[PDB]
């Protein structure tokens, strides 16, 4: 399972 | 380029339409056109630029990972020879991905970063620079990889230094930067302990500042804090 | 074109990779290249061609509907004037959609249909011809719309005539053709009663033939029959 | 709600 980075908005 | 004849305001308007239509390649082209008008970007416009390219490179990264996995399995012992096609197509996707990263880095260098004087804008752009070097690092092999990794690190570090001096610990830009730099440490730089330490300290310092925030700002900050927590759970 | 230098077998191999990577534009370009080699397509290859272009036009259709809805709201009373941008961008997407449809219709006319002699291949291609004229009809306005509608109808009708003579009522190609022609009747041709009658008779005749099928063929046929049922529930 | 057409496979 990959690390989560941010999601732009 | 192709957007040279379209008004800045029209490009921004169409970027928003493209977002609604989930046409992210179009959205990116419109925002590139807007940047190339030469004026600085507002907060909203910066976010449109980021959303557009994040979605474009996101699709490329997902495709690259699928193809790389197939290629890696092809080079196992017992695997039948299937010719050059898997490598060729993985290389095709990789080249396109590198092209998009280079485009973004080009916009940042000509001339978004140098004209960005406020902390919110400068940190935003330096974080983006780190992110797109990180995406290049994901597909790089060898000595070139070392230089790309150092470029990502350097951009993130400059952003971190500014953010710590100029922004509160709950600022969403600061939080998102720390999140992505922690991912860099874990996934790229072979530094899981640094990743964990950064995520922990970021989370704890934000926790202690939540009391200063409105309901809406609290929601914004805690959303990103949850991502730090999710990673810490995965990593520990 | 650009695929002229690549082996037929390599194009097919890369189409399958593109599918796995959800790179449908690439998949379509590879399959176009394969068609243009001039040899007939196998059953599997026909399905690859269909999957590729269905996904490409699918994204365009979804985007067009989003933009058309915004445009329609802009022309309501009380809506503020926002300039030409919504229309322009809807037109851009529309033109690209029409281009893809024209590409598919071009492949069918040069020379897939004329070389297709077996019922399975001929019905498949004539159904595709009806589908892509139907997608053109969705965005057409006026007298041009009338001709496009007639072209869709004619292709579907030829396919239906062959399918009824040459295929069992449970054949998945026959079922999918009847499904899509019923959608044509309901959504394009302003003929809801014809749509309902076609869906009902198709369902009932398939039901009566299920006893002849293996477990696997039964699964294939009943999946499509469920779509007929779903539409009938929506329509009645 | 739109009518459902077939999905290729
Ligand atoms: Ca101007
Ligand atoms: Ca073997
Ligand atoms: Ca091969
Ligand atoms: Ca390469
Ligand atoms: Ca330790
Ligand atoms: Ca809590
Ligand atoms: Ca754990
Ligand atoms: Ca050959
Ligand atoms: Ca008004
Ligand atoms: Ca306007
Ligand atoms: Ca038009
Ligand atoms: Ca009636
Ligand atoms: Ca039943
Ligand atoms: Ca009903
Ligand atoms: Cl390739
Ligand atoms: Cl446009």
Author numbering:
A (entry chain P), D (entry chain P): 290 to 298
B (entry chain A), C (entry chain A): -4 to 231
What sentences appear in the manuscript?
Our model was applied to identify novel putative binding sites on biologically relevant 14-3-3 client proteins (FOXO3, Myc, BAD, Notch-4, CFTR and p53). The model was used to screen 296 potential binding sites and to select eight peptide sequences for follow-up assays. Experimental validation confirmed the predictive power of our model, with three out of eight newly predicted phosphopeptides exhibiting low-micromolar binding affinities to 14-3-3, two weak binders and two binders with marginal affinity. Structural characterization via X-ray crystallography further substantiated our findings, revealing binding modes consistent with known 14-3-3-client interactions. This includes an ‘open’ binding mode, where peptides bend out of the 14-3-3 pocket, an ‘extended’ binding mode, in which peptides occupy the entire 14-3-3 pocket, and peptides featuring a disordered C-terminus. The identification of such structurally representative 14-3-3 binding motifs, without having provided such structural information to our models, testifies to the strength of our deep learning approach.
